[PDB]
Coordinates of C-alpha atoms in Angstrom, one line a residue:
Chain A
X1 CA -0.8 5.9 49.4
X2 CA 2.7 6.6 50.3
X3 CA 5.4 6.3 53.2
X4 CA 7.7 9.1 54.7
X5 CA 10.7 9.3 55.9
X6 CA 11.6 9.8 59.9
X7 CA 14.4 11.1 61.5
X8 CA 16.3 8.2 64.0
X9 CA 19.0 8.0 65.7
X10 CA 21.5 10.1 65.6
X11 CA 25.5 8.3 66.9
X12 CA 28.1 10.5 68.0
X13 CA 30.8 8.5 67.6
X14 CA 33.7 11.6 68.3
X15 CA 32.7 15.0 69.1
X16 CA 33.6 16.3 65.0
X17 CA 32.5 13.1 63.5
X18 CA 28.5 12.0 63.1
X19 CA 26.3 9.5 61.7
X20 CA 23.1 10.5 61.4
X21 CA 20.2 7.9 60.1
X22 CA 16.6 8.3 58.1
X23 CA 15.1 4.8 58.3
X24 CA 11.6 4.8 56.1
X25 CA 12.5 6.0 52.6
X26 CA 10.7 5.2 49.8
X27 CA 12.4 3.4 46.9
X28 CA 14.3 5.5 44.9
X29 CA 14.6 8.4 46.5
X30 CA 17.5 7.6 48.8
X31 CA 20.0 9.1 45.9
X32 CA 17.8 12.1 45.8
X33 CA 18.1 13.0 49.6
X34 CA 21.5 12.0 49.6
X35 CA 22.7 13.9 47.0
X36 CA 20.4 16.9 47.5
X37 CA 21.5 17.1 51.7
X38 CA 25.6 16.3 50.3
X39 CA 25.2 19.8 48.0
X40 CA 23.2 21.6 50.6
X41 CA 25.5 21.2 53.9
X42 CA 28.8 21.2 51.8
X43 CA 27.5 24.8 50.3
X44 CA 25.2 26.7 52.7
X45 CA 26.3 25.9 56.7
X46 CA 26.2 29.3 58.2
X47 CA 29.4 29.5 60.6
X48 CA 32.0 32.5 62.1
X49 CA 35.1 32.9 62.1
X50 CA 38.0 35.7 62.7
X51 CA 38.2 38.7 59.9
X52 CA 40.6 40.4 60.9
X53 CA 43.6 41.1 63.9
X54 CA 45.4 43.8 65.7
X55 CA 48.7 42.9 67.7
X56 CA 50.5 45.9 69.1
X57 CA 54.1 45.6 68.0
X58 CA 53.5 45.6 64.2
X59 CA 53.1 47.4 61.7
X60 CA 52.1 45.0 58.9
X61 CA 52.1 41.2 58.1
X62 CA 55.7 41.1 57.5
X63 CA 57.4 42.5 60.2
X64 CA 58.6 40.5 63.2
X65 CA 58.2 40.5 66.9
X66 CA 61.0 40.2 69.1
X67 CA 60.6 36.7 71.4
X68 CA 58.8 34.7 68.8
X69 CA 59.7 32.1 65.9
X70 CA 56.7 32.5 63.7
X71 CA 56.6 35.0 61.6
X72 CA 52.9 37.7 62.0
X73 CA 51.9 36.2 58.3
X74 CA 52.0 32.4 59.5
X75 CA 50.2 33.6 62.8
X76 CA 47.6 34.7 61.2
X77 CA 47.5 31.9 59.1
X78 CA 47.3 29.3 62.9
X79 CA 44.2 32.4 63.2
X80 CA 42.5 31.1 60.1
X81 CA 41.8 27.5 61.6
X82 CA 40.5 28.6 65.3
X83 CA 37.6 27.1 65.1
X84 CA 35.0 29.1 67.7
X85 CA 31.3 29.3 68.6
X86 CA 29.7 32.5 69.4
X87 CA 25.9 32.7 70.3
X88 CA 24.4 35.9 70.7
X89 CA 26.1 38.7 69.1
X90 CA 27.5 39.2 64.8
X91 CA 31.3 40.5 66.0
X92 CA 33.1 39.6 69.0
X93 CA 36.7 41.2 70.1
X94 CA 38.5 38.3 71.9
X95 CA 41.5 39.2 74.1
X96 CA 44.4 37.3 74.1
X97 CA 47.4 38.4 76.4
X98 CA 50.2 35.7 77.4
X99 CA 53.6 36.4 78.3
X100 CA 56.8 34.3 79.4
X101 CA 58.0 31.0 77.7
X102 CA 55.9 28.6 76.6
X103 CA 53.2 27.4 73.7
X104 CA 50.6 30.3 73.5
X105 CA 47.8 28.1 72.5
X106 CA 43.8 28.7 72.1
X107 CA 42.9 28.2 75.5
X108 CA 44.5 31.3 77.0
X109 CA 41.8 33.5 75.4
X110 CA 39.8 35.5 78.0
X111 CA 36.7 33.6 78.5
X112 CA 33.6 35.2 77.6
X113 CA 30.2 33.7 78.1
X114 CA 29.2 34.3 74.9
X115 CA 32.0 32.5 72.8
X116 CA 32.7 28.8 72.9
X117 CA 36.6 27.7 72.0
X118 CA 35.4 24.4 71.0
X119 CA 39.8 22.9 70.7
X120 CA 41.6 24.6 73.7
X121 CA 44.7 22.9 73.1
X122 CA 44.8 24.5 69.5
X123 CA 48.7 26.3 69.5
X124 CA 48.8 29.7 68.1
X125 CA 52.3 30.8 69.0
X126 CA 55.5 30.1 71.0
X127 CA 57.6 32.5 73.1
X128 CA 61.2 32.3 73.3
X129 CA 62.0 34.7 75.9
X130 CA 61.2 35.5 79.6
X131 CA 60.2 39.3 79.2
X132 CA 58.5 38.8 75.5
X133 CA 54.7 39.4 75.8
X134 CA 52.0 39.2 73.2
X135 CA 48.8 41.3 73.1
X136 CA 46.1 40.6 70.4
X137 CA 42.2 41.4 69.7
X138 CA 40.0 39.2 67.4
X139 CA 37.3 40.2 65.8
X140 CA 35.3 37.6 65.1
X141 CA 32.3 37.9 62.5
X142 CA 29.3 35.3 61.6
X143 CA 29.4 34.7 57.9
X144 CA 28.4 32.2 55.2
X145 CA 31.0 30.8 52.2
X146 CA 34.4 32.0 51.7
X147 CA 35.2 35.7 51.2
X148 CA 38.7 36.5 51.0
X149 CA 40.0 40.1 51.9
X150 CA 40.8 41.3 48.3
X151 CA 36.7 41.5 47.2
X152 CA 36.0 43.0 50.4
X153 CA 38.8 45.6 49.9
X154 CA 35.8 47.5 47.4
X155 CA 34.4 48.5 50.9
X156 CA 37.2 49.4 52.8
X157 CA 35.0 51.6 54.8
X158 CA 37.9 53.4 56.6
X159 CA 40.5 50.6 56.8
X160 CA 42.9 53.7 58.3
X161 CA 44.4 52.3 61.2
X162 CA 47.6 50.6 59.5
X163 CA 47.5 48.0 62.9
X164 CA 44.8 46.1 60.9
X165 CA 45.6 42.2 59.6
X166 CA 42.7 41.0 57.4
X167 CA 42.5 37.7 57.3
X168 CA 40.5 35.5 54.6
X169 CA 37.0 34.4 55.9
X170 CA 36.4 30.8 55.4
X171 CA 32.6 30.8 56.8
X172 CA 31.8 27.1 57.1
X173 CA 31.9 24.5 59.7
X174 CA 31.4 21.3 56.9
X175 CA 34.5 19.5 56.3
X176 CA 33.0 16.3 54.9
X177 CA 30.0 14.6 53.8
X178 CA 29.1 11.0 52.7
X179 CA 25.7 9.0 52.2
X180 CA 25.1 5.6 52.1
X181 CA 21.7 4.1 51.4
X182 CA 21.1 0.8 52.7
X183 CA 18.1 -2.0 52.8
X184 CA 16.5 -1.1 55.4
X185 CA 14.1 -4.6 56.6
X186 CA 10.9 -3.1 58.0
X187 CA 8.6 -5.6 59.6
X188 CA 5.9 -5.2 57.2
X189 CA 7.1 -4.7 53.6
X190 CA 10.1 -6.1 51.2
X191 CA 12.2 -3.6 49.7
X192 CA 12.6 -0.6 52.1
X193 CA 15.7 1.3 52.3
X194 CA 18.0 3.5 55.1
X195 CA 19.9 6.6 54.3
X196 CA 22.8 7.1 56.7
X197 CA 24.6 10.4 56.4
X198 CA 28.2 10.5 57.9
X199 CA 29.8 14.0 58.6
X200 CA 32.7 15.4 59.4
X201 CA 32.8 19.0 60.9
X202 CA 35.1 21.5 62.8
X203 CA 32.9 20.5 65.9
X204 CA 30.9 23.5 66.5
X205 CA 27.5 22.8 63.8
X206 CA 25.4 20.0 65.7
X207 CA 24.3 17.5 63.6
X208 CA 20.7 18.2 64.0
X209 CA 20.7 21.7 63.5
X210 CA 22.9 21.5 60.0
X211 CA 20.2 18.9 58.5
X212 CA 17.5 20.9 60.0
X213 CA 18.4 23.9 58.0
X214 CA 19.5 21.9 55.4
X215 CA 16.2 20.5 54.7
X216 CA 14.8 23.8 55.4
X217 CA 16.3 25.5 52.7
X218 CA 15.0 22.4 49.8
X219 CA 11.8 22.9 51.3
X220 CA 12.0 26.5 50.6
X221 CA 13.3 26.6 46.5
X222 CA 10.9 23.9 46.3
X223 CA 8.1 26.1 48.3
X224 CA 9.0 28.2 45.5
X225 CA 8.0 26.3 42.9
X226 CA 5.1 24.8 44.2
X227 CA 3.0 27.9 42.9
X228 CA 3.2 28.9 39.4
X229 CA 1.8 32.4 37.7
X230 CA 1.5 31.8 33.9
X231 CA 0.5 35.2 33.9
Chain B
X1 CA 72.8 63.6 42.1
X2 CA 72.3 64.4 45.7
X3 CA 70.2 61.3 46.9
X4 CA 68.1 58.4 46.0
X5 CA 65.2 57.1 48.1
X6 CA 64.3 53.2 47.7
X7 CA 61.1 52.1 48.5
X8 CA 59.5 47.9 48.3
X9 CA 56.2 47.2 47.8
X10 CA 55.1 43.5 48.9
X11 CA 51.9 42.6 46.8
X12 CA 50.2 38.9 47.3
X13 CA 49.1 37.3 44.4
X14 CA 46.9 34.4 44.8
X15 CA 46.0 32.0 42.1
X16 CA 43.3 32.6 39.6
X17 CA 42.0 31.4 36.0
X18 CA 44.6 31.9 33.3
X19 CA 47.7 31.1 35.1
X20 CA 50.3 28.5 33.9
X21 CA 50.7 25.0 36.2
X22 CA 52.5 22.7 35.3
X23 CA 54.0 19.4 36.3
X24 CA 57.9 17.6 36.4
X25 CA 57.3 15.7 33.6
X26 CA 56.3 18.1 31.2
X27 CA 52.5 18.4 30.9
X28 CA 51.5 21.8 31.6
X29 CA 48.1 23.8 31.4
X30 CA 46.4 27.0 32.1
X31 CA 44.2 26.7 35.3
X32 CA 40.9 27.7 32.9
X33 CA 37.9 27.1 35.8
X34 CA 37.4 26.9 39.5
X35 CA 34.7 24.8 40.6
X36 CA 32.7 24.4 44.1
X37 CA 33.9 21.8 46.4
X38 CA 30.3 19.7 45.9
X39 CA 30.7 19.9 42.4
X40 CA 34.3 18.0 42.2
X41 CA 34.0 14.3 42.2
X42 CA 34.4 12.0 45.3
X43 CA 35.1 8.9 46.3
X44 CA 33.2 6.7 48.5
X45 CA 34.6 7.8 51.2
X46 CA 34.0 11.6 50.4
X47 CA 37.0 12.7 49.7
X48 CA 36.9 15.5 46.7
X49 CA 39.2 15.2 44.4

């Protein structure tokens, strides 16, 4: 003798901002869900993002390119926040090559099927000068949490070529989470409520597919418990 | 002496447990724990403090 809960529908009201909705849960555990799902998503969203650069003309972070404003350090920095979709494949080398003046933004990198550049208009650099051009490759890795350079420096692994920028990895997508549970009037009982989950992301985790594996990891730990040894 | 070579290092420090912060007023502390986003409290909104 008990309910369950089923997934409805899910509002998109902008393409990084989500409301998704679970109308038949029991009394009392509406908290529970909410706060379980809040921890899960803000902690464990798989995503991928750039490790590390090569430009051509410098030697290290803190040199200078002829033709540009921005310091390399602060363009890596504009690196840390493209926020990118790849499919198939763990590490991707993007290309980007622009020259002449203008805004060198996101959408100028060559267009692979595999990759997704979910905010073309995001600016990387600016040119100052008719004959300055900029060469780059991004490498591009798939990656859960936040590992910054300095822990990975244990495993160097060949780091040789002094061309190479490493970048801190910030794997995940989640910016934001919030619940609300809510009386939720079904035809046939009194005190029924709704869980509505609002959340905020970088736009490239569908909402389905981050409560999906959200839920799936619970189930899991919980799995784990379910049998005990005693031995 | 004959001649002198100079050479800069650059290090980057980031912050970690044990520094000093402090504020314009006075109050100061040493930063003793850094906790998980989820952990922090947040307001209805969801905004972590």
């Amino acid at each position: 003798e008990f309910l369950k809960p089923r997934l409805v529908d899910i509002e998109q009201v902008s393409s990084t901002h989500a409301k998704v909705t679970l109308e038949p849960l029991e009394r009392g555990f509406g908290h529970t869900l909410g706060n379980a799902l809040r921890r899960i998503l803000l902690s464990s969203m798989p995503g991928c993002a750039v490790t590390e650069v090569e430009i051509d003309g410098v030697l290290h972070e803190y040199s200078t390119k002829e033709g540009v404003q921005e310091d390399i350090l602060e363009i890596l920095l504009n690196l840390k926040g493209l926020a990118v979709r790849v499919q198939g494949k763990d590490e991707v080398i993007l290309t980007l090559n622009k020259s002449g003046i203008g805004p060198v933004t996101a959408a100028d990198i060559t267009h692979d099927g595999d990759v997704e550049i979910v905010k073309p208009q995001h600016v990387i650099c600016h040119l100052t000068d008719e004959n300055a051009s900029i060469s780059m490759r991004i490498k591009v890795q798939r990656g859960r949490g936040y590992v910054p350079a300095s822990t990975r420096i244990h495993s160097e692994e060949d780091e040789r070529p002094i061309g190479r920028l490493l970048v801190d990895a910030c794997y995940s997508p989640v910016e934001r989470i919030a619940y609300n549970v809510e009386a939720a009037r079904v035809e046939q009982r009194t005190d029924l409520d709704k869980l509505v989950i609002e959340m905020e992301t970088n736009g490239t985790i569908d909402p389905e597919e981050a409560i999906r594996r959200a839920a799936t990891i619970l189930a899991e730990q919980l799995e784990a418990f379910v049998d005990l040894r005693d031995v | 002496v004959l001649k002198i070579v100079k050479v800069y290092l650059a290090v980057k420090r980031r912050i970690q447990p044990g520094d000093k912060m402090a504020g314009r007023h006075g109050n100061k502390g040493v930063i003793s724990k850094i906790n998980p986003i989820e952990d922090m409290p947040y307001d209805e909104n969801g905004t972590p403090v």
